Structures are given as structure tokens and as C-alpha cells.
Design a protein around this ligand. Sequence first.
Ligand SMILES: c1cnc2c(c1)NCCC2
Ligand SMILES: c1cnc2c(c1)NCCC2
Ligand SMILES: [Cl-]
Length: 163
Amino acid sequence: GAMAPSYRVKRMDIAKNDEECVVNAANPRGLPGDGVCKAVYKKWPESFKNSATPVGTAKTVMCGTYPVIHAVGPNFSNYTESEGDRELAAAYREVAKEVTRLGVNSVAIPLLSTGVYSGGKDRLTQSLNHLFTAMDSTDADVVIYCRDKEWEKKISEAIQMRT
Ligand SMILES: c1cnc2c(c1)NCCC2
Ligand SMILES: c1cnc2c(c1)NCCC2
Ligand SMILES: [Cl-]
């Protein structure tokens, strides 16, 4: 575990992370995809061997010895708000199981279902709160990756609020 497990946020490409493993915002079919998934495909293409997994699950595949945790958030275009919320919570619980199993001291994680899968809604608070519910009981250093300057401030404020 980390000596004083923390949450941090960085605004940059998750393919440049400084952590012991990465969570991919994957699609269920293990396809290269877009956004976080395409950056992950470019950096760790070997990790997409047999990475297909259902919605609400995570499947880890090694790129050399570096673990890529493929986490499949729901596409809110297809799910009801209610069923989408259940699957988004579930995907993060499966990420916490994998991070624990791998014995890493740190993990890079994007906010699931906040981009192309958001159904055109702002889901920062919803996705971040499911991330916390899952990860609070782990002792890995969690580093959250985002792209948007305003999201960086809101994530930073949410982390600081609880400290
Ligand atoms: C997250 C992912 N990609 C990028 C950024 C952040 N910032 C700059 C351009 C590329
Ligand atoms: C491409 C690569 N990394 C990231 C993104 C896109 N979007 C969210 C933050 C991390
Ligand atoms: Cl997304």
C-alpha cells in the first residue's frame, strides 16, 4: 500500500501517467475506440488482446509487466438514468477489486462515462462520487486524469473538501 494513501488530479494525457497501473475507459468489445481508449490503444496496444468484457466490469491485461485495467462504463445514450447509474457504480467496484488484486501502490484513473458515453450530460459529480465509493477502502495512491480546465478545478475542490 501507499504510506499515506491520497487522491490527486492532473490535467494531461493518461498515457503519460507516473503510476504503477492505468484504468482504460474501455468499450465492451476491446476496440481501439476514441478519447482515453484511443490514447491507451496507441501506448499499450498489447493490452487489447482478449480485453472485451461486459458493461459494469473490469478486465486486466498486461502490457509487458504494466497492468491495463479495462473498465467498461455504461453508454447513457442506451441505458436509463437508473440502470446507467447502477452499471457505473459497478464498473468502479470492479476497478477497486483489480487494483487490490494487483498489489500496486498507485493507479491512474479517468472519470468513466463522462465523455462520449455521457449521453450529452455533465456527470463529473456522479462519476467522481462512484470512484470515491469504490476506491476509499483501497490503500493505493489514486491519480485522476482529466482534459478540461474547469473539471480540474471542480475535481480538485471535491478532493480537498473531504481532507
Ligand atoms: C488530456 C489528454 N490529451 C491532451 C490534454 C489533456 N491536453 C493537451 C492536449 C492533449
Ligand atoms: C486522451 C488521453 N487521456 C485523457 C483523455 C483523452 N481525456 C480525459 C483525461 C485523460
Ligand atoms: Cl466516456
